[PDB]
C-alpha cells in the first residue's frame, strides 16, 4: 500500500488481517490481507497459503482501527476451513486462479458479529464489473496501521499491451493503477480487497494477487477478478 491515508473504525470494516502462527508462545507473523464476505467466510489469495495450506497455521483478526478497542472474544478467529482454488498455478510472473476461502470462528465458536468496526462486503453480480476508469479503493498493512488508497480500473486491452504485461494477463484478472503512478498495492497487501462501486454499492471486485514492482510506471497491480469466481465461491459458502 503506497501512499494514501490511514483508516478509522468505519473505513474498510470488512478487512481481515491474516497471521501465520509461530512455534511456542512467540507472537504470530502477518501474512496477508483478506475480506469478510460472509459472517463465517473470509476471501483471500491462494498464493498466501500454498506453502502451508493446513488451517492450523493461521489466525484471523477483524475490526482493526485506531479507535477500536481490541476484544479477543469478538475480533480473534481460528480457521476451521482453509480452501484453496484447485487449479491454482504459479506462472512465470502471474498467479492463476489466485483465490482462497477461510471459514472462521471465535473461541466460543461464533462467527463475525456486525458492529461499527466489523461489516461484510457484497459480492459482485456474475461477470459484472465497474466500468474501466472507475475509482476503486485498496487497503492493507503492506509496504503499522491500516491504510487505504484509490486506484483506477485499467482495461485489459491497455493492460495486455507489450510494454505493460502482454499475454500474462487473462480475463480472470483485473488491472488497476494510479494514472499518476503514485499510488498502488505492494508486497504485504496480497489477498487484500479491491473495492469498486457497482450500482452505487461497494463491492469486492478484486483480490490483490501480483504485479511487477509497486506503483511502477506502466505496470499496474493485478487482481483476481472476483466476478468470475462466484460459482466457485458460493459452491463452498452456501
Amino acid at each position, epitope marked *: 500500500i503506497v501512499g494514501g491515508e490511514f483508516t478509522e473504525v468505519e473505513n474498510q470494516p470488512w478487512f481481515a488481517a491474516i497471521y501465520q502462527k509461530n512455534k511456542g*508462545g512467540s507472537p504470530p507473523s502477518f501474512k496477508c490481507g483478506g475480506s469478510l464476505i460472509s459472517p463465517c467466510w473470509v476471501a483471500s489469495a491462494a498464493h498466501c497459503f500454498i506453502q502451508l495450506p493446513k488451517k492450523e497455521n493461521y489466525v484471523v483478526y477483524l475490526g482493526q482501527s485506531k479507535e477500536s*478497542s481490541y476484544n479477543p472474544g469478538e475480533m480473534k478467529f481460528e480457521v476451521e476451513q482453509l480452501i484453496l482454488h484447485e487449479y491454482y498455478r504459479e506462472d512465470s510472473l502471474a498467479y492463476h486462479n489466485d483465490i482462497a476461502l477461510l471459514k472462521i470462528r471465535t473461541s466460543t465458536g461464533q462467527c463475525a458479529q456486525p458492529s461499527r468496526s466489523i461489516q461484510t462486503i457484497a459480492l459482485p453480480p456474475r461477470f459484472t464489473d465497474a466500468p474501466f476508469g472507475s475509482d476503486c479503493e485498496i487497503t492493507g498493512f503492506g509496504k*503499522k496501521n491500516l491504510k487505504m488508497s484509490v486506484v483506477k480500473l485499467v482495461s485489459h486491452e491497455q493492460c495486455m499491451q507489450p510494454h505493460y504485461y502482454g499475454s500474462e494477463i487473462n480475463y480472470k484478472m483485473l488491472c488497476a493503477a494510479d494514472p499518476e503512478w503514485k499510488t498502488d498495492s505492494c508486497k504485504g497487501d496480497s489477498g487484500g480487497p479491491l473495492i469498486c462501486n457497482i450500482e452505487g454499492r461497494p463491492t469486492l471486485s478484486g483480490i490483490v494477487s501480483w504485479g511487477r514492482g509497486c506503483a511502477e510506471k506502466n505496470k499496474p497491480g493485478v487482481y483476481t477478478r472476483v466476478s468470475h469466481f462466484l460459482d466457485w465461491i458460493q459452491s463452498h459458502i452456501g
Partner: nanobody
Amino acid sequence: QVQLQESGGGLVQPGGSLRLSCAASGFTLGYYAIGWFRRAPGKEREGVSCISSSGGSTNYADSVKGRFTISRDNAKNTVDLQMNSLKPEDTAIYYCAAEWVPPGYGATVQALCNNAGYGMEYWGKGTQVTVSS
C-alpha cells in the same frame, strides 16, 4: 511448553492486603497484555485488572478501583496484582491470562478486561484468595 503460573493465594482478614504474582515459562511474557480474572463462588468469571505489554495502559473493574494495583516487570517476566483493603466480596479463585494484541487497534485494554476474558490465549491454573473473619 508454554506455562502461566499464579502465586500468592492465601487467607487474609477483611481490610488486609495480599499480593499476587504471575510468572511465565517457555515464552516472553513482555509481548503480551495480561489480565487478572476471578471467579467467586456462584458467579461467573470477571475481569479484575488488566495491563498492556509495555505497561503503558491499564484498566480496573469498578469494584476494585483505588484498592487494587496491577504492575509488571518485563525483565523478570512477571505481572503483579497488589490488593489492599480486601473485602469478603473479593473471595475467589484468581486467574492470570495472557493475550497478544495485534497492531492496528486502540491503545486501551478496557475491552480486554470487561468481557470475562473469553478469547484470552493463555491461562494459569489459578490461585485462591479468601477474605474472612
